[PDB]
Amino acid sequence: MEHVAFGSEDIENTLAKMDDGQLDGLAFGAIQLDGDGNILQYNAAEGDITGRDPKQVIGKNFFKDVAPXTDSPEFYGKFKEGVASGNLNTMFEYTFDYQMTPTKVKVHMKKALSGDSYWVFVKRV
Numbered sequence: 793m794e795h796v797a798f799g800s801e802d803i804e805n806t807l808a809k810m811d812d813g814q815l816d817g818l819a820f821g822a823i824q825l826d827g828d829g830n831i832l833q834y835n836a837a838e839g840d841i842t843g844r845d846p847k848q849v850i851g852k853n854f855f856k857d858v859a860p861x862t863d864s865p866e867f868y869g870k871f872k873e874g875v876a877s878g879n880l881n882t883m884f885e886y887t888f889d890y891q892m893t894p895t896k897v898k899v900h901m902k903k904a905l906s907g908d909s910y911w912v913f914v915k916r917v
Contacts, residue, residue, distance in 0.1 A: 794818050798915050799883065799900055808905045816846075821897075821914035824904060827875045829855040829868070838914055843892055854912070861890045871901055871910065878903065880910055885917055 794817035796806050807815070807822065812833060815822050821838030825831060831849050839846040844858065855863045855871075862868055867886060874880025883900045900913040 798913060804902055804905050804911065807911065823854065823912040825854055825910045825912060827908050829853050831858065832909065841895065841897065841914055841916060842888060859890060861888060874901060874903065875910060
């Protein structure tokens with residue numbers, strides 16, 4: 793286990809440039825998106841929560857392709873606002889239900905330190 797808590801105040805500094813292997817050590821799901829929502833990183837904990845294969849989703853668009861249930865004002869809308877402002881930091885509960893058993897989660901979206909990069913962190917609730 794990497795010793796990082798979900799929702800930690802400095803999470804973007806701790807995860808900065810974490811390689812795919814180290815990201816797989818987190819206790820929570822972690823996705824890194826570009827500003828358009830394309831998947832740059834996707835860890836093992838997230839694949840366990842959602843069923844997706846962390847290796848296969850990289851390069852897919854999260855909102856258009858992988859997670860259409862998040863293509864809504866309550867998820868994608870918040871993401872694209874926070875990308876626009878360059879200050880994204882939002883935590884909210886949500887239900888993931890596309891081609892899966894509906895699963896309620898807590899989501900934390902936060903701008904990364906790397907260019908054109910945004911984290912989506914996920915844990916079960």
